[PDB]
Amino acid sequence: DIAALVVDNGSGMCKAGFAGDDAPRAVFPSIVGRPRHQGVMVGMGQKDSYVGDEAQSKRGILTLKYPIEHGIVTNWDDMEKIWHHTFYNELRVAPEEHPVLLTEAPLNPKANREKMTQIMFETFNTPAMYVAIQAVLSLYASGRTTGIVMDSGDGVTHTVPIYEGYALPHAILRLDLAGRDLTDYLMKILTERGYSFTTTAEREIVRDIKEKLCYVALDFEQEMATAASSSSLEKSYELPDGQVITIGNERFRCPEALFQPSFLGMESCGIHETTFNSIMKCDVDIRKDLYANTVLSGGTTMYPGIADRMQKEITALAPSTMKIKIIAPPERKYSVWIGGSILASLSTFQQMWISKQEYDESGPSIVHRKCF
Amino acid sequence: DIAALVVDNGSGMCKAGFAGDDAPRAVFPSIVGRPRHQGVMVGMGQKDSYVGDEAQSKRGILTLKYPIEHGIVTNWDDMEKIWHHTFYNELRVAPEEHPVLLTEAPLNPKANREKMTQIMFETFNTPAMYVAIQAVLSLYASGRTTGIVMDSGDGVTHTVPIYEGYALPHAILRLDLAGRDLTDYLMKILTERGYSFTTTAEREIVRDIKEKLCYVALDFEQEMATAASSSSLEKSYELPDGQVITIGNERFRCPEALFQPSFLGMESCGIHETTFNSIMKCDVDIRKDLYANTVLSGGTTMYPGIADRMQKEITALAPSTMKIKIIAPPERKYSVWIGGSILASLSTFQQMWISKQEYDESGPSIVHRKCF
Amino acid sequence: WXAXCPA
Amino acid sequence: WXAXCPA
Amino acid sequence: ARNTLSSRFRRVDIDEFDENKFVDEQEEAAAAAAEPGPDPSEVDGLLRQGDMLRAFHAALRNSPVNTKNQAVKERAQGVVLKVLTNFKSSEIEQAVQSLDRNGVDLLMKYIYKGFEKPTENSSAVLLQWHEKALAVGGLGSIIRVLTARKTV
Amino acid sequence: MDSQGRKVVVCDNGTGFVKCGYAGSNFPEHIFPALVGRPIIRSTTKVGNIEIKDLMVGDEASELRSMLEVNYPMENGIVRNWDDMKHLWDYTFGPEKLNIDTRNCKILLTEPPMNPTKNREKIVEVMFETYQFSGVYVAIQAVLTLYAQGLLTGVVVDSGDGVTHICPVYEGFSLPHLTRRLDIAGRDITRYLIKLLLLRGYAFNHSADFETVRMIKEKLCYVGYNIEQEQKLALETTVLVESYTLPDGRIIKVGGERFEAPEALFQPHLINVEGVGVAELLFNTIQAADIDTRSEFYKHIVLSGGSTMYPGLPSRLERELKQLYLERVLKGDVEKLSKFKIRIEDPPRRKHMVFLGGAVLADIMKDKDNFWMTRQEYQEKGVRVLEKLGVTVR
Ligand SMILES: Nc1ncnc2c1ncn2[C@@H]1O[C@H](COP(=O)(O)OP(=O)(O)O)[C@@H](O)[C@H]1O
Ligand SMILES: Nc1ncnc2c1ncn2[C@@H]1O[C@H](COP(=O)(O)OP(=O)(O)O)[C@@H](O)[C@H]1O
Ligand SMILES: Nc1ncnc2c1ncn2[C@@H]1O[C@H](COP(=O)(O)OP(=O)(O)O)[C@@H](O)[C@H]1O
Numbered sequence A, B: 001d002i003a004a005l006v007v008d009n010g011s012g013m014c015k016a017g018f019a020g021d022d023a024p025r026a027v028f029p030s031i032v033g034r035p036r037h038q039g040v041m042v043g044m045g046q047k048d049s050y051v052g053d054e055a056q057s058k059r060g061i062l063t064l065k066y067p068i069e070h071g072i073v074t075n076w077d078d079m080e081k082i083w084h085h086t087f088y089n090e091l092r093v094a095p096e097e098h099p100v101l102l103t104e105a106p107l108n109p110k111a112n113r114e115k116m117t118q119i120m121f122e123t124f125n126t127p128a129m130y131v132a133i134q135a136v137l138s139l140y141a142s143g144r145t146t147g148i149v150m151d152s153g154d155g156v157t158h159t160v161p162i163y164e165g166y167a168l169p170h171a172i173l174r175l176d177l178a179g180r181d182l183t184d185y186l187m188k189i190l191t192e193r194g195y196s197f198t199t200t201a202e203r204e205i206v207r208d209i210k211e212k213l214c215y216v217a218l219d220f221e222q223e224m225a226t227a228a229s230s231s232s233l234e235k236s237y238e239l240p241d242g243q244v245i246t247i248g249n250e251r252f253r254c255p256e257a258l259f260q261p262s263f264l265g266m267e268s269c270g271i272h273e274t275t276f277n278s279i280m281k282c283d284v285d286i287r288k289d290l291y292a293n294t295v296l297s298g299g300t301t302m303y304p305g306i307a308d309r310m311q312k313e314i315t316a317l318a319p320s321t322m323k324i325k326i327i328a329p330p331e332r333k334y335s336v337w338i339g340g341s342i343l344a345s346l347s348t349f350q351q352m353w354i355s356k357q358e359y360d361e362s363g364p365s366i367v368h369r370k371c372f
Numbered sequence C, D: 001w002x003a004x005c006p007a
Numbered sequence E: 001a002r003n004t005l006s007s008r009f010r011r012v013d014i015d016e017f018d019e020n021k022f023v024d025e026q027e028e029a030a031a032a033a034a035e036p037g038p039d040p041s042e043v044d045g046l047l048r049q050g051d052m053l054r055a056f057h058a059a060l061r062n063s064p065v066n067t068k069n070q071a072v073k074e075r076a077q078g079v080v081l082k083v084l085t086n087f088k089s090s091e092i093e094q095a096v097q098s099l100d101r102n103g104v105d106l107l108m109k110y111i112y113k114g115f116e117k118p119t120e121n122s123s124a125v126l127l128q129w130h131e132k133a134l135a136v137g138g139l140g141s142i143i144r145v146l147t148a149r150k151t152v
Numbered sequence F: 001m002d003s004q005g006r007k008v009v010v011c012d013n014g015t016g017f018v019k020c021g022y023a024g025s026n027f028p029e030h031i032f033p034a035l036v037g038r039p040i041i042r043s044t045t046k047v048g049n050i051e052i053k054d055l056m057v058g059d060e061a062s063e064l065r066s067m068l069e070v071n072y073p074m075e076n077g078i079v080r081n082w083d084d085m086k087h088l089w090d091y092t093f094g095p096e097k098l099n100i101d102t103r104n105c106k107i108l109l110t111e112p113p114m115n116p117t118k119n120r121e122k123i124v125e126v127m128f129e130t131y132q133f134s135g136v137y138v139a140i141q142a143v144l145t146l147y148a149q150g151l152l153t154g155v156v157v158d159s160g161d162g163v164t165h166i167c168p169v170y171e172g173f174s175l176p177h178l179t180r181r182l183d184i185a186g187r188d189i190t191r192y193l194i195k196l197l198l199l200r201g202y203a204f205n206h207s208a209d210f211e212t213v214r215m216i217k218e219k220l221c222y223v224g225y226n227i228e229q230e231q232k233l234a235l236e237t238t239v240l241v242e243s244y245t246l247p248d249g250r251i252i253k254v255g256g257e258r259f260e261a262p263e264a265l266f267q268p269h270l271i272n273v274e275g276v277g278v279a280e281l282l283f284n285t286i287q288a289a290d291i292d293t294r295s296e297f298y299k300h301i302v303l304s305g306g307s308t309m310y311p312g313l314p315s316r317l318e319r320e321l322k323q324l325y326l327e328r329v330l331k332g333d334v335e336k337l338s339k340f341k342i343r344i345e346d347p348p349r350r351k352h353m354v355f356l357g358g359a360v361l362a363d364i365m366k367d368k369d370n371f372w373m374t375r376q377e378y379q380e381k382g383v384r385v386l387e388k389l390g391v392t393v394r
């Protein structure tokens, strides 16, 4: 029958599905490929367009472009294609019969969501729509209503505390260090071994190596010492052609940047200090529950042994009597969307929808009035 | 009285001299020639391998091999021969009485420095040595402490931004694209006229054609129409056997690969965008000083028209109110060596050597802690 | 190089 | 060819 | 001219590492339960007693024609050679004519395996043995010796 | 033939052999050597009954070579003699060959890659001014080979009589920076065989004796597999000596030469060519491509050209590639070599792959008007009409 679609559209990987399911129906790396070589044969397929897994497959002759970068849609001529593909080619459903719940990171350009609403209501002709913060979705995906959502996608990382359903905007923290920055740092440090990756195609290989073999250390200096002393901490990966490379010390040097951004030259604070600061910006009467219900989410917090590291860090920073518990669900990689589908199955969210005529009567700015 | 030796050893050309001079004592191509015939006039000076200039004067009957490709030493037996010829035949000085200041490209594998140190301390038995980044000496020689160095050697092209003496290692960029790729691309585009150069002893003739005739066009899409309309742009060259070639259009299509690497089948951006991105990676405050102190260096930047085109590019790329000044002196073919001789002669440097005692205490793994 | 590019 | 090799 | 590039990649013989090469199968019962072949003590007892025909037949009673162990094969070969090279040159025809066709097809293998490690007069008698065994069994015996896949 | 009755001819114009026919055909209608001969007298030959015209071309100029001085109009894919080439083309479109009225026909021509542009420009000029064809297209040889095989990806190793070239193509997108061109082919192998035979006391110094040595190299010679084992066979045994009867009647004996003349493709330094063999050049071409295309390039190695018909060339190429891969990718791990999957596609009719691909492409694009270079466009622009193909010339 008639339901409400849910299109996360986070950076790196676009997720989409139908409300009610426990997993996004169509998830694909949100990229656009473009051929950098001139075709000569008749019979070859499309040109100037390759989206998702189709682009990932033929990346050997394409240049890849992420339309989203650090949470801000840089090129709309490609994001429109991404939406067209996830509507007509992956979910395989007309977008003029279903509400759509999009997601946006906190503290973003207003024109971003303005153009989002304008494109949703002007090209795909959806009946209604809604844009929500990813954190609120993540907490609404954990079934909790009191916690500090620590989300970390590929282009943004944000700590958002929420208490009794009330969101505190004064304490929302957003660090820009995220997954793709870790991928770049890995590409840079892999040169020490002698492995050069400089193509946007081989960036995918590096990203897969990262999310397959990289793990964040519990004690950085001790792990460095053990890696420098012995070879019992060296893993082997196999490139697509068939070569086998070895990564040792890099394995934990790559994710360690999340706690010491100075590795990237970014003179800022880590993600654990960001969590601690976003907590210390809340009222004094609620800091303990936030200390107790820290929830993680996103495809950049699945590194083995990250929950214990964050817990150690916060406990070192937080007072002794305060108890620290890092709620790390082993499904967080899609948690926000799960939250998305959840927020789409409540009779309380079936009236917060920005109607088509509501957009017509006031223009695209209505997103700021209705959506928070 | 002991004076350090400044020995560059970059790809394509090796330049050695004494510390405290205004010009390198001995410059010679860093090749090793293996005889590819079996000569029976025994006793007339036959050898197993000719190094440096002695190879060029015989390149007709030799296979010339470069031990350093893209800044990386791919053959260490040949590099030991290069260094022995530098020490005992070009400089004519025992290595065990002087410290040696070698240079290296940024973002090279750590095995390169490790083996450089191991060879300089276990084979040539030097009392002290050092390894410096080339683009830093290229700023030492320019008489500055703030600027962005754009060093384009024969085999590698890297950009290093420095401000007030504090280098920004998070903005050092590297591009494996230099004279050796321009010379192999000219060898390809010369076939359109009918000229077929294939032997490693004709790559030198093509490199000579390139370094004597080729120039960088200020406007490629206009100079193409110019060279298409009239024959007022052709130049003739005389091979060492009598035949004469003529090249009208190839002249600026050879160095145009620097600004459009897609000509060589490379995704990477040109040298102007490589410099601009490396500027915009720094902080907002120091970008104005980096703009107006853009230094050039290395042989590949010895093209008539390189500074004009670089300025026209980085000015159409930089904000409309920033002043761009391409610092390009005619002595930039050897700025790195002058910087090395300046650095090795300073008094405050005499504590930065790596002493033989230090190497005996920690092996070749020390060059990573001392050398920046 | 070992992986990527020759050197 | 014209320069290099015969053809 | 001469080659000034590395040609050491031609020395590696990848054909010995092939996966479609021929491997000689052997039966699982013949690989698990090995047959010890003849009993040497019985043979020395029958030789000391002085009966040549019965010692000969006891040498060919059972043979490691199914095992893969080199020690048992070498020992059985040694015992049967000890029996063969000790006959009188006259009683060879009578001993040969007392064997079935398989007996001759095995005696010829034990003969052709006695030429490979000869002594002062072992081959001078193995040649007479071969003469009689070929008179009885014909070239088919020599061919069943050549085209065998397990040597005794 | 298209919807206008204008025959669509396909002509390969190889350095060592012309293969011509019509579009959609499954086999070249005419395959004849591309050589032009002129009558001469020789003190050792006597013929007085076969009428020999003042200009023999093609097949008859090769079968009657004993009484002619023959010369090829092409060399290394570059037309050295334009008058002899015009005679060869007059004969090709003449009555005793493909019989067409060139005023009302389209033609599909070929050309090797990385070739001087004046060559193609002059060929198009000749086709539009002398024969006045109504349409001309000049396709790429590797593209035609992949058309004939029925693929969209693969690394065509096209080794003709005149020149060897390795061209990879991925998913239909041509990578022109990986096109390699080695100048050793049938003709240099024939010259090397002439040298080797001269070491034995036989002298083939005339223009006609070259075709005799060619026919010897085609019957007897073969590419070795384990060159150490082949040298052991040639030095220890005598099972490689084979006799051949020359046309005059002499009987020559060819031994180890059988595997030394065609070895100059894998070991060029035998004929004073400083480079790498066809196997090492193929491996370097592959390993110069992006990491994501190498694994598919290894599985679609398409052989083409006559010079790849030596008995045992696919297997030797595969063995060479496996050894290179074991030493320079797996760094010496024999366990992983069994996982390396090559597939050297050597079709049986691989001697005319370019013509079959041209036939397929012409059968596809005969009825279009934006594919062919029309004579009107030539009369209007000149040698600029070639810009239709994607080759920019002014
Ligand atoms: N198990 C994992 N460990 C480390 N990194 C991962 C893992 N899974 C995914 N990633 C990384 O997360 C990045 C993007 O995924 P994700 O953050 O889920 O996208 P989004 O920002 O839209 O949620 C990718 O670069 C990927 O490599
Ligand atoms: N005057 C010139 N014009 C054009 N190209 C040049 C010129 N001088 C040098 N080159 C190119 O740059 C390279 C020489 O640069 P060089 O400074 O010798 O490199 P390195 O310092 O690493 O030895 C050569 O390969 C050549 O192709
Ligand atoms: N079976 C064969 N074995 C070895 N060489 C051959 C064989 N057939 C032809 N050749 C060589 O290759 C040439 C023919 O190949 P072909 O592809 O027709 O050349 P072209 O490039 O002229 O089309 C002949 O000149 C001959 O020297």
Ligand SMILES: [Mg+2]
Residues within 6 Å of the ligand: A010, A011, A134, A152, A153, A154, A298
């Ligand atoms: Mg996200």
Ligand SMILES: [Mg+2]
Residues within 6 Å of the ligand: B010, B134, B151, B152, B153, B154, B297, B298, B299, B336
């Ligand atoms: Mg330099």
Ligand SMILES: [Mg+2]
Residues within 6 Å of the ligand: F012, F014, F015, F160, F305, F354
């Ligand atoms: Mg051909």
